[PDB]
């Protein structure tokens, strides 16, 4: 009866129970049909034709969501619903009837007894044992600024960049191209994404980096292959998530996301942007390059008022920021009163998530 | 060996169950995140710090209360307050005693040009 | 407590209940009885469908008021009615005969070993330390003004208005829809209830205090509701008791509290008007308001000969002003004589009431 | 507002509604009586510029007197206020009914014992009832001189100011009084925890329910305290026997509850309910019933102002 | 440059800095501290010892917190219904002795209240020397509703002693009370029936619970265990003519405005190390419950730390932005003197 | 009727009959194949590529960690497994996952009869004869710092350091590099490994020490290396292990581990501390070296308080005093209701052991 903890995101689904350290399972966001019915997450991806029902955070497609969630719960956690409180996560700026979709669906189609969704980067901000600061959130489909002030996130002043993870990856792939490795399939794009995980790590200083690169290495390193060809990686390891920092790079017109932190931060009310300077969280799969910390540090005291106190939180968990976050929470005494019921629900239908709130 | 598992033994039924542990403060509550019992109270923490940081400014004044009864009214000094709302009390119940004993009868209002006969 | 007198102040609103010599009473409930949609008090609130036995002051159900009084017995103060002497309070005007089914009852279906009746109004001044004095009472469902002298109500100069909290609450209801907030069930009229109980107040000078709003804002207030949502009032907060001064607000052809004040004073012999003037005592929910008392003042100021003293008393235990006076007069070594016992009742039977409570 | 409670030995004086006399200090005063008004202005000018410091134009001003006070005391008391000192207002009010009112009662009977006088004052709705008030001239500084007379046998020998001072100090810190006087005598000669000084802890006190013990053929303070109930009217007694409280600085001694609880049982009929109330704060019980007086609403009515006593004379204060 | 707090109780000073979790540092309170381990200043509730209190924060200061108090802004706690007298002199002592820049004094009770999340509520703090009820609005104690008793922790370890004397086990001295206060705090637990749980002792046991004393001899006992704290709900078990804490809780509340009880009655919050029993809380429901308007919400609500409830809330007060313009400054010490604590600390 | 113990740790499995003094066997924690099946152990040293399914005191490989599971029951101990209750030792916040997939592969492929898993430093704690105190565990790839009250470990306060015995043979051959000692190959790493346990020892003074190698010494030390051929060593002796109190040495920025113990007693209830200092239980491989004990004395007395009593448990045996202490409870009367029976986990599945193991 322990409640269960789900963060849909763009590219991975995180689950799991409260109270737990880390989401119990973590599979691709997909559901594949022949190109017998269909075929959820790594089912597919072993002649199937693909779909992520969620693009750029959002659930845009409820019948293909509807079945990535019966696999979790049935296929993954293995746990009748029925017999578990369940909190769903959202993504920043998410539209109301969403919520109200995504609840109903749990309730009448899941029939949890109790459910609860919240914001994604706000669980973030709350596992860092905070109530306020300015999340940068970033995973494979999207990236958020949010500030959070009192566990309010501010829309106003929040930030969309559809730059993420999975760009990263295939402009990784396109680099890869210069030294003339030929990366295409299901299987090759996998291996590029290892490496990228494994090898990338963010240039303190880019131009520096460059005049350096083409100079000495330490830089270069080695990687083998399944089949056991070993291949070698130069540049490509701070130049692949520089493009974070210029979008031009992927030929995107939009700001670095130091600027778009900075311009989000300025978005708020001025009394509190002290609080903020003082509270930047990462969180997401694609803050977790080596040297982020301090590049970003660098851009935003760049940018700031040159006497503010300025600090990056960058847990090292950060990769599971959200949903652990979501555990957390899920597990607190305070919290339980907060559960939507299933009698709720009736007698007041899907609105009702809208009200409550810390 | 055989004396190393007596003692245990021994001190194994000398122990209190964790549920009454956590009820003692000595264990953080089984069912939150065991790595994260730090940020967990962090964030409690903040949690009221905030709720204080707003109950305060919205912090009435002693008047007011007063207003509402919720305060005796009005002066002298915490301590008194308690006896002096029991004296309060006595001296005006007294003070109302005579007051009902020495009521004028019907007849006097009447004459007095007060109510019909 | 073995043979401590009670005290029974019978709203039309609310029942306050408790024992002699406290400061407080014991119990405040509802004054309702309800059925299948029989319960009493917060028993009925929590799928019934209800009954008030009290309209505007006068008892008017008798087998719903018995079980009101049972309730209070055994399930709120929780006593044996033979073991303790009651006192009950009544409005003024009250008919004889409803003098005598309430003393019949308390001896015959109770067997009290003794009783009183007071008047509501009375007790209020008593309890403000006069016998002397000109009280207005209101409460939920009726206004009065009653003149007194040496704790003698004069029945030729009482002044009874209809108009009351409910009233006012009613009132309210109906202006904030201008602001277009629907408020209309039960449970929602309670909630402007609480409204107009916390942030309600009475203008000085209300002509003054509406061209007064327009323009500053001490003026607007926020309200949260149940549901989490946000409301704001404005005028209202005093355009909602402007109506004890202006019936004509509800459409009422009375004239206001302060007019029927001065009139009922104008009722009096002419040599008691000083001190009726200069001990003008206000009791009752109603009386609450901020500002009331000052408002008053004024507006009895502009009506008396400019010679004059005018004094308001409004204590803050004004709500409650009825069911004190009760208590300390039950108290009273000189009131121990004043009990009707069971056996004058036996002797002369219902009647007895008007030749011992006066 | 200002509270000055007169007693013979300590004048207590402060500001109504605080928890104690702000100043206590040290004769203008006997048995409770001003009996020297030379010595009076010069203790109460004293009171004003040097203990309190403050400007007497501009604080009204409450004072205690003994029960059965004269009433030309309480006038001239009252001409000297206004006259001299210029206070706004002022109140005279009695110091045994102040104690009582100190436990939040104002109907009882009390024991007052300070330095100078003791009295039995059974008090009905706020009032004193003359006619049955105790006076007793054995009092806190007797009761030093008597510790003085015993300690002779221990021949330890004190007579000066300084002396005095040493004795009454000894007096308040280790004296008691025995639940049963005979019981503790045949006990001291035995064992001893009793010893810090042995049998005297215990001997002082007991000349107040024994007054022979300096000569007096007196009756102790339990049965004046009985005698006064008996002067009451039947009716009003139980009320009485049930609110017994103690106040003055002579009332401090351990254990002395206790013993009267078994005296006055020893008097009323054996059915009677019997209640002896004693404050750890009854030094002063005088004073703070005075406190909370003067910071009652109720009272900033019931002031003589100085207005009303310009058009009246002294002779306003009965 | 941490603003520092201090909770000073009859039997414990909680030191420590603001913002921490609970006190860097917690000692006995008599003379300084744990010297004297290897006169009590405070005794019920109330500082009585003005030299010793001295030397007690002196200790604090320098041996305890390691800190020049001239740096640091300080925050005192205060027993409930604390004469003006005291507010005063501590204010001086602060200024004038230990030349602090700026402090405060707030309630014990209200600190642990805010602690708790509430600015509303009714407390019972019971520690070693003293226990109150304290009813609470918005921040503000109600005076006149303010309950007292004399009975606390020390008197139930000191009557623990007593009764263990039945058995036969003979604890008296200075390091025997130490002995059975731990055993006390180990083992001491509140019945939900008693009546019930003495009928129980009698017969069967999963009730008598064995003790290994430091000379390595066990030690066997029973209803004791629940008897010690037992004295709480009857404190007649010492011959204390005064009803129980459940009883006073009933009657605090009652003496508060009709109006405020409903939030009284479900915001009633425990605090202090002698609420520590196992049982308590249930208990005091199960007694609060048969006593009130059978309508009535009544929670009870007891934190795991609230043995530090008071510490922690002086902690998180002092934390707070909010707070930092309401310190009385050394500056305006001086224009007002001592009597500047009523009209800033309330 | 005989239950078993087995102590997996990253470097070595601990494994013995219950009852029994000592394990009886103890081998290498590896899985080796061709650089006919697969080697496990020993077997593997006879070439080869390794794996470790331990890394850092956690399973990482689960396949390979069953070949580890397979060759202590039947070419270690010789065993059918089937025939006993079997009790399985774990790192401290193990996570949930790793516990029951642990005991489902106990129930699932050796038919254990019965079965247990607890915490490695409860174990060591309780061969110490005590049921609270704080534990230093120091193995072969992690150290922790685990205080434990009435048996329960407190994971709040637990502390891990990646830093350890494996770290420090590593570390020996790099400073032994100096003296121009050259050791890298297979077999050199274990001739350093024997220096280091033989050799080896914690300066109390560790500047004053390094002051006086460089002096006189009593210091230097002779070892015949296995070819015949003599070294000598000197300070290498106490610098090699000084990098647990200074990880500095091979530039780790984690403080050292009388810090972390000290930190980790301050994270615990005031009312505790007390009684972790003086109780503070030495345990592993690593905490083998002579004069550690009181090194760590010094350490902390000088970080706690200076009227805290202090005390170091080293028993000499600490070596396995994991699976001591496994052997200790294995055999007690009171624990034989504790096992997890194959009928209770038929009917609970593996998350039983959330239930009965703690
Ligand atoms: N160590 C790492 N370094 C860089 N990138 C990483 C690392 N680990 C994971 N990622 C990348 O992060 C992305 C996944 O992050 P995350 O799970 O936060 O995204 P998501 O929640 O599925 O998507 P979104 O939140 O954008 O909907 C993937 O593209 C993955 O390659
Ligand atoms: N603070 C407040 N401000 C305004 N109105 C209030 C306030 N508190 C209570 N009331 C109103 O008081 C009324 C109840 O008061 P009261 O108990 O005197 O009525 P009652 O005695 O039951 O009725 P009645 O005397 O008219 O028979 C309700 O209408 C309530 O809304
Ligand atoms: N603890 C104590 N035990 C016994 N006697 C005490 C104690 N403390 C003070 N006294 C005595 O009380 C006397 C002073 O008390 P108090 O101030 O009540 O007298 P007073 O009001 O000056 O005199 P009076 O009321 O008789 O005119 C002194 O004799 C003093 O020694
Ligand atoms: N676990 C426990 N069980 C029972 N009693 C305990 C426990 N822990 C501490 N105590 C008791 O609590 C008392 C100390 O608590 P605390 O620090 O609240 O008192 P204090 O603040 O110094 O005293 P006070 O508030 O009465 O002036 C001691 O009597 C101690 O034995
Ligand atoms: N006398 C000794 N002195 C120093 N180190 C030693 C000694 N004996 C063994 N060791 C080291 O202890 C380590 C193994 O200890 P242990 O078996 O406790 O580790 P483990 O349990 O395999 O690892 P962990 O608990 O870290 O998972 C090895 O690095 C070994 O060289
Ligand atoms: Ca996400
Ligand atoms: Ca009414
Ligand atoms: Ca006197
Ligand atoms: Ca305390
Ligand atoms: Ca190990």
Request: net charge neutral.
């Amino acid at each position: 009866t322990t409640a269960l903890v789900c963060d849909n995101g763009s590219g991975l689904v995180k689950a799991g129970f409260a109270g737990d350290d880390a989401p119990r399972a973590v599979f691709p966001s997909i559901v594949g049909r022949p190109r017998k019915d269909s075929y959820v997450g790594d089912e597919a991806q072993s002649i199937l034709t693909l779909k992520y029902p969620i693009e750029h955070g959002i659930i845009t497609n409820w019948d293909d969501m509807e079945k990535i969630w019966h696999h979790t719960f049935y296929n993954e956690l293995r746990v009748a619903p029925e017999e578990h409180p369940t909190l769903l996560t959202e993504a920043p700026l998410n539209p109301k009837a969403n919520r109200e979709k995504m609840t109903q669906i749990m309730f009448e189609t899941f029939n949890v007894p109790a459910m609860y969704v919240a914001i994604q980067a706000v669980l973030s901000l709350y596992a860092s044992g905070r109530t306020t600061g300015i999340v940068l959130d970033s995973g494979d489909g999207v990236t958020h600024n949010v500030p959070i002030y009192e566990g309010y996130a501010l829309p106003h002043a929040i930030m969309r960049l559809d730059l993420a993870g999975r760009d990263l990856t295939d402009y990784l792939m396109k680099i890869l191209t210069e030294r003339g490795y030929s990366f295409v399939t299901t299987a090759e794009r996998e291996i590029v994404r290892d490496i990228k995980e494994k090898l990338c790590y963010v240039a303190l200083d880019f131009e520096n980096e460059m005049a350096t690169a083409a100079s000495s290495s330490s830089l270069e390193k080695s990687y083998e292959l399944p089949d056991g060809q070993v291949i070698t990686i130069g540049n490509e390891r701070f130049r692949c998530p520089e493009t974070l920092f210029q979008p031009s790079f992927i030929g995107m017109e939009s700001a670095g996301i130091h600027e778009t932190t900075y311009n989000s931060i300025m978005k708020c009310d001025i009394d509190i942007r002290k609080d903020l300077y003082a509270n930047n969280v990462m969180s997401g799969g694609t803050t977790m390059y080596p040297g982020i910390a301090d590049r970003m540090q660098k851009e935003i005291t760049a940018l700031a008022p040159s006497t503010m106190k300025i600090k990056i939180i960058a847990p090292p968990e950060r990769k599971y920021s959200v949903w652990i976050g979501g555990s957390i929470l899920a597990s607190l005494s305070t919290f339980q009163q907060m559960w939507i019921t299933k009698q709720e629900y009736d007698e007041a239908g899907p609105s009702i998530v809208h009200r409550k709130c810390f | 060996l055989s004396e190393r598992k007596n003692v245990l033994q021994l001190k194994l039924q000398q122990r209190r169950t964790r549920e009454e542990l956590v009820s003692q403060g000595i264990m953080p509550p089984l069912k939150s995140p065991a790595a994260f019992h730090e940020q967990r109270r962090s964030l409690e923490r903040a949690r009221t710090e905030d709720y204080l940081k707003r109950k305060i400014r919205s912090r009435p004044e002693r008047a007011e209360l007063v207003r509402m009864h919720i305060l005796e009214e009005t002066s002298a000094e915490p301590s008194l307050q308690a006896k002096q709302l029991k004296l309060k009390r006595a001296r005006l119940a007294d003070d109302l005693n005579e007051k009902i004993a020495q009521r004028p009868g019907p007849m006097e209002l009447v004459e007095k040009n007060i109510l019909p006969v």
